[PDB]
Design a protein around this ligand. Structure first.
Ligand SMILES: O=c1ccn([C@H]2C[C@H](O)[C@@H](COP(=O)(O)O)O2)c(=O)[nH]1
Ligand SMILES: O=c1ccn([C@H]2C[C@H](O)[C@@H](COP(=O)(O)O)O2)c(=O)[nH]1
Ligand SMILES: O=c1ccn([C@H]2C[C@H](O)[C@@H](COP(=O)(O)O)O2)c(=O)[nH]1
Lengths: 137, 137, 137
């Protein structure tokens, strides 16, 4: 495993709302929960910015994280991400936030502590370009 | 290359509908075909769950796969994924299924065996958190 | 870092429109700018194909790139990608193009040289399948 520093921004986290964790040893992602104080309605076509109450610091520039929709919420309820895929840079230290977009025609309720997205840590490569007139092998 | 076990769930696979394969030596993804018995209409804004007739077992927890829209179908026909990006965990052993979402204003027909998404195998990192009061280097 | 060959297809690139570059040492992605000659309107629900004026050649089959929405444009303006996520194969040598999709209810103007998406280089794994009757460890 790789160590990622995490700062708790809302005292509910770790008390009434658990920290993100892998469901199983073979899980690729961690479910991300929202830290709101009362249930929130997301109308058809509405986008709402939902806080997580946590900040992470990946630090290692060979690593990033992406925020993805949950499969069931996205397929069954059309509850996905307004930016489609959220990209977390290694030097980002602010709160993780979810752009929650209801792409369906049905109203949806988000309760405090609900899992609304998933977080996946991926290696990334920092490219340097070489400008050429023609491509070569 | 890396070996991924594949179980055929529908006898058409490998007979009338080919197994997923890289188009070229330099392809990042494999086209994923649907295993339906008759053509299916996907109306504007409709989401339909489409089977592939295959199950995979990635097994290695340092590896995952993602299901992505095809570029031409998504750009030209608005045929994309209802969950936007499908994440396949290393310990998932069920059938691969596509959440096919028509985001366009035109009706679309999916024929048996059509390529509707693409599958990409990516390394992933399992993070362990360290809860801190302030971030450090 | 890893060297990626880049061919300039429009003489504005590197003169009036900068080459893609990482904003910070810890950035995971590079902002991708559009190479159009006059401002372009993107109406609600409209998809437009926007050129970048550059081609890249990743070459290494263990590497790919993805094109993702920008977070603010996607969350605030609903300016995302019609194919949701663009996948760039290592053997692709054509112009990078953005499927720009306005998922919002507000008209949006794209100016020449605007950053409209981001590009991320990721390692990928080329799988070989082993067809089995039952999965094993
Ligand atoms: O869904 C998202 C996308 C981004 N970010 C964070 C992590 C990014 O590194 C940072 C800056 O976003 P940019 O506008 O620079 O992409 O915002 C989120 O909290 N959620
Ligand atoms: O588009 C998708 C997304 C997920 N899955 C499979 C692989 C996942 O590991 C499994 C469980 O999904 P979750 O609800 O746990 O994300 O479903 C698919 O078949 N297709
Ligand atoms: O948003 C996108 C998606 C793809 N491509 C390029 C890179 C791919 O390797 C190539 C071929 O696309 P396919 O139809 O084979 O996926 O098009 C783009 O320019 N932009």
């Amino acid at each position: 495993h790789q160590v990622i520093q995490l700062k708790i921004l809302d005292s509910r986290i770790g008390d009434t709302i658990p920290l993100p964790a892998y469901a199983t040893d073979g899980s690729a992602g961690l479910d991300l929960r929202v830290c709101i104080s009362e249930p929130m309605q997301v109308a058809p076509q509405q986008t709402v910015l939902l806080p997580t109450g946590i900040a992470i610091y990946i630090a290692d520039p060979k690593l990033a994280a992406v925020i993805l929709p949950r499969s069931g919420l996205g397929h069954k309820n059309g509850i996905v991400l307004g930016n489609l895929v959220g990209l977390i840079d290694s030097d980002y230290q602010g709160e993780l936030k979810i752009s929650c977009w209801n792409r369906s025609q049905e109203h949806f309720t988000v309760n405090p502590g609900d899992r609304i997205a998933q977080l996946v840590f991926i290696p990334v490569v920092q490219a340097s370009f070489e400008v050429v007139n023609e491509f070569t092998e």
